[PDB]
Design a binder for this molecule. Structure first.
Ligand SMILES: *C/C=C(C)/C=C\C=C(C)\C=C\C1=C(C)CCCC1(C)C
Length: 309
């Protein structure tokens, strides 16, 4: 595995470099909709803790085995490293969305709760600590966490798979999905809304028009894995290999390593710097005539202005 980890946690880093500069680039004016590279700093930098250091050093060849921990990009930083993306998109997706999901909540603060859902976030990182760590200490369980082996995992992996496949789900792509939908009914105020994510979505304060590329990606961000894998990930993680689920994994662990590709999910920058703009040159893009080179802070007295752009 060490060099599918370069094919594709290198080239993953550092075009997660020219991605993961960029929410340490300034440390942004973080957070916003680039909390996503503060969430996916602790989740696509930690997906390098991960695909360099320990899951590529000690981490799984390299090492090992080890353990370590959850494997631990896989148990930890792909909870975080995909969980956090499920979240980072129950917000983005559909941060059409946040702001019209919700109630724009104060004129902000349909920030949410996404800032404050960043405190929901470790709410499901103390709550993907809670089962998770007492997932391992449900006990061996601590199978491919500690072992990286067994022997609940398998006699009887159904609780254990059969609860977390069905435990993150249980709710985590149950209501959210059903809640979470609905203002993914701000996805029917979005299906007619790319006339809104176009003009209150090429123009709802922050980074957005291309915001509408919103949902070119964000339901292929749904789909990209998490349609063939909501398929071959639910049914996979009935788990049931020995020797065919894994292996098979990779493929079952490929597209969430081609969803460690925060590249066409930084542009989606977009998102702070595709608005500011309005202007003379170029696109990504915000009306578009030109789109530049305007707004900047406050968010403008001129030339691509003030709810800019
Ligand atoms: C690269 C390896 C990965 C991403 C390993 C595990 C993936 C998950 C625990 C996926 C969680 C999710 C599910 C089941 C459904 C909604 C989307 C999701 C990514 C949060």
């Amino acid at each position: 595995l060490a060099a599918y980890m370069f094919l594709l946690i290198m080239l993953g880093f550092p075009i997660n470099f020219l991605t993961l500069y960029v929410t340490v680039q300034h440390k942004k004016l973080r957070t916003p909709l680039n909390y996503i590279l503060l969430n996916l700093a602790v989740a696509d930098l930690f997906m390098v803790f991960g695909g360099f250091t320990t899951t590529l050093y000690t981490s799984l060849h390299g090492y090992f085995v080890f353990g370590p921990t959850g494997c631990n990009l896989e148990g930890f930083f792909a909870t975080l490293g995909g969980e956090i993306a499920l979240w980072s998109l129950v917000v983005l997706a559909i941060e059409r969305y946040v702001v019209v999901c919700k109630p724009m909540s104060n004129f902000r603060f349909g920030e949410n709760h996404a800032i404050m859902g960043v405190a929901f976030t470790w709410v499901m990182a103390l709550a993907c600590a809670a089962p998770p760590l007492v997932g391992w200490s449900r006990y061996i369980p601590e199978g491919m966490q500690c072992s990286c082996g067994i022997d609940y995992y398998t006699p009887h992996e159904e609780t254990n798979n059969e609860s977390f496949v069905i435990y993150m789900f249980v709710v985590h792509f149950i209501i959210p999905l059903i809640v979470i939908f609905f203002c993914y009914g701000q996805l029917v105020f979005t299906v007619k809304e790319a006339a809104a994510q176009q003009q209150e979505s090429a123009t709802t304060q922050k980074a957005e028009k291309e915001v509408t590329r919103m949902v070119i990606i964000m339901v292929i961000a749904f789909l990209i894995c998490w349609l063939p894998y909501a398929g071959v990930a639910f049914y996979i993680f009935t788990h049931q290999g020995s020797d065919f689920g894994p292996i098979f994994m990779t493929i079952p662990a490929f597209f969430a390593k081609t969803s460690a590709v925060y590249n066409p999910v930084i542009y989606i920058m977009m998102n702070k710097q595709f608005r500011n703009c309005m202007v003379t040159t170029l696109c990504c893009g915000k009306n578009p005539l030109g789109d530049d080179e305007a707004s900047t802070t406050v968010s403008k007295t001129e030339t691509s202005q003030v709810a800019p752009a």
